[PDB]
Amino acid sequence: KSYVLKFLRGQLPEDLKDVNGALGCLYGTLPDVDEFGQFVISPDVVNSFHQFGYVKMPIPVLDHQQIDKLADEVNELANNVEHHPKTERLYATSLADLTGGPLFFCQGQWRAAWGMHDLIYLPTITVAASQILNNSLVRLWYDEVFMKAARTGPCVPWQQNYARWQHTKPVNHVTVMIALDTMNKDRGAPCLVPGSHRWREGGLLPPVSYDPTKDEAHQLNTIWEIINEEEGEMLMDTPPVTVDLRRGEALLIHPLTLFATHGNRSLDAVRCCFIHYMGEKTYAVQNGPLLPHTTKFQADAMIQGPFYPVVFDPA
Template sequence: MSAPEPKEFSTGVPDWSTVHQPLGELFEPITNGKDWAKFMLTPEMIEQYWLDGYLLNIPVLTHDQCDRIIEDYKYFMGSSEKHPGMEMLYEYHSNQSNDHNNVLMHCLGHWRLTKLFHDLVFLPRILMHTSQLLNPNRELTKVRFWHDQLFAKPARHGGVVAWHQDYSYWTRTKPMMHLTVHIALDDQTEENGALHYIPGSHRWTRNGGPLPVTDFNFKDMESIQTILTEDEKLQFKPVCGRLKKGEASFHHPLSVHGSYGNRSDGPRRAAVLNFFADGVCSDTDGELLKGSYIPKGQKMEGQFYPFLFDPAWMQ
């Protein structure tokens, strides 16, 4: 069955967030429920995730799929070819650090703008892995979309992303049953600014919640040290999450991670998808994402938070 037509954000500009099924732009649809099983992680991989707080080197895209997605990246990289739907983005920073020697392009909401970024949200392999990793009880879990992100670091002066826990920025939703998928669209190395993780840091909390945010502009790598305990400082042993093009890392919402600058001669581009379990609720009457409001205590659902996977579909 073909996907329905999207509603328009403005005349002639479709808003793809109004379509809650894949468009067929990036992958072949699953027509047999039993086909989901071929994307399942092994029990050993799931245990590794809960031990360290992350998984590395999970293949999710082919090189061809990465190259096609990179073609859409041009709309967000300051080129003359601007997408007519840029106002749909929840956030857009051509350089979030405001330092021309430390450039970091960062945006949220691009799944609304292009068919390829829209369909990336629905990629079966990613949804299956996410369903397996969301629940600490190791039970397959229904999955909803939270939001996407793009991070791009240009050659030689690409910026840092300071150490943080993702859930520190997401406390407007609860309970904490979230997960982040970081997809490498270029090979990611220590030289070009790959993510680094602190193993076991997904167990670091403050009064049952996440660590406080120490740098909203992402540029001070050492700022997290001001809020760590002595034990946490002793455990602070970064691991470089090297990824090949098309591979992803999956990490827990409390996993402390960050990335250093790009000192290489090529760009370092990544697409990030953030998910939560069906049943997570709003914890604010304020704005959740730009233009999105759900009353406090009510379930996160609707146009911007599509339902993506149900284990019952595997039958």
């Protein structure tokens, strides 16, 4: 180990993936090995997720005195006057053109900012994700955020998560979504079909078409293009339902579920976060990096490395 100068002995590495653990920010630190058994989720929630393809948590997982700090980090990550430091360590951001737009997103941001690094290891969601994945180990894949603009905030059409995850051999994932602010059907709350995860025996629906200028209603009524008569009858049986979220509520989804999110009609912005987990027994498909500037794997190599740290391990 080389000699570190006297006034540099407390700093941190450029990429926060190296600190094998959670910083002492936000919540104190990880609980002891025995103290991990209080975050468990009631089985009824598990059956509800199995049936409807999504489920909400009974209690919020964050407090306002932490959500305000997270929103401060999110606002800082969007500066177009002084670009946020550690920008080059992100997977991809909408500000790569130095102009941005009415939508702001960043992926793999836990490698760039404090606090949000500590969010990954929050027990109250990691243990729930472990329970959803049949009581096994969990692994972070990549985290991203969304911030809509003011009353001209665009929407996101219907989508299936696995449509972006062809590189994974099995369908063994889960997604946790955090609402950083109060959300509503007039502000950008999500709407998802309560049975789209049990269609075509797990098949993947054809990709949807969209136009970058039409109104939100037209982008919402393009679902009929994909479905057939059989799926149409279930659509009549199971109409789409929108869920409203307050500050700090969490929603668990399934990778095969159709989902979309309305636009922004309020007077300001709105923020939300998406975290995607794996279980064990997960292998790549092709030879190459799953994400830009990540570790390369073999055609049938198990997925593991520094960029995909373990979070929670039962027993």
